[PDB]
Amino acid sequence: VSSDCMVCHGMTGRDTLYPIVPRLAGQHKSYMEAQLKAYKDHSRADQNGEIYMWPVAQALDSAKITALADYFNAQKPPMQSSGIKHAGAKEGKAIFNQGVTNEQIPACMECHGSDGQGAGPFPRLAGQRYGYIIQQLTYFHNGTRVNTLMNQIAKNITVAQMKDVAAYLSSL
Ligand code: HEM
Ligand code: HEM
Numbered sequence: 001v002s003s004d005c006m007v008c009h010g011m012t013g014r015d016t017l018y019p020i021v022p023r024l025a026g027q028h029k030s031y032m033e034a035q036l037k038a039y040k041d042h043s044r045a046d047q048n049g050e051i052y053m054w055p056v057a058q059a060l061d062s063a064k065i066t067a068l069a070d071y072f073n074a075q076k077p078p079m080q081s082s083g084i085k086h087a088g089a090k091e092g093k094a095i096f097n098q099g100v101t102n103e104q105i106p107a108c109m110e111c112h113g114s115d116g117q118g119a120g121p122f123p124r125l126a127g128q129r130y131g132y133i134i135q136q137l138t139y140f141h142n143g144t145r146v147n148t149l150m151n152q153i154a155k156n157i158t159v160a161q162m163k164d165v166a167a168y169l170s171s172l
């Protein structure tokens with residue numbers, strides 16, 4: 001019953017309910033799967049996750065998690081820019097692809113791929129919602145969304161740069 005999801009995550013013709021609800025279309029299976037399991041075992045405990053995903057995840061078994069992961073991964077069209085213009089695309093592009101050395105900000109593409117397509121456990125960011133990206137970078141920077149990799153990666157990202165990388169990524 002994907003309509004246990006689509007109310008919020010939207011549907012082929014409707015975006016997600018709010019900027020903080022990430023698009024799922026085309027997200028990699030292993031990633032989707034990891035998140036759903038994290039929500040289920042509460043390992044991903046950032047605020048929005050606790051509030052809007054622990055509940056629904058609690059009613060998911062290994063089989064459904066995988067079924068769902070598969071479903072959204074195949075969804076078409078994969079998560080795309082809504083068309084809403086976000087300032088900083090250029091800035092964010094340089095950050096995503098080149099990172100910022102003196103600020104010790106890693107080049108995002110090394111893990112998220114040449115253009116935010118991601119791969120397996122490394123999530124696609126291309127086409128993700130602007131607010132959602134900023135929100136997750138905030139959670140990673142905050143430490144409220146626990147992930148050794150991203151907690152370390154987000155350590156030096158400022159709110160301003162989060163917006164740039166978000167603008168860029170959500171425009172893809
Ligand atoms: C069983 C159906 C659902 C599935 C499979 C599902 C799956 C997911 C996945 C895999 C993510 C993480 C995406 C990412 O990291 O990019 C996510 C995030 C989210 N979902 Fe769902 N979801 C479902 C239903 C819902 C519903 C019904 C709501 C609203 C009550 C909801 C609200 C959210 C929100 C707000 C987030 C982002 C939370 C956060 O920042 O941690 N989801 N969902
Ligand atoms: C400043 C560059 C980077 C930015 C802006 C960035 C941004 C993000 C965002 C917004 C997410 C959340 C995706 C979602 O919820 O759908 C994410 C997840 C992730 N990123 Fe990055 N990232 C960057 C660099 C990296 C690097 C260099 C690595 C590998 C060392 C990495 C590994 C990951 C992994 C593994 C996840 C998924 C975490 C999980 O399993 O829950 N990221 N990243």
Ligand SMILES: [Zn+2]
Nearest residue numbers: 028029073120
């Ligand atoms: Zn895949």
Ligand SMILES: [Zn+2]
Nearest residue numbers: 082084129130
């Ligand atoms: Zn957007």
Ligand SMILES: [Zn+2]
Nearest residue numbers: 141142155157
């Ligand atoms: Zn700080």
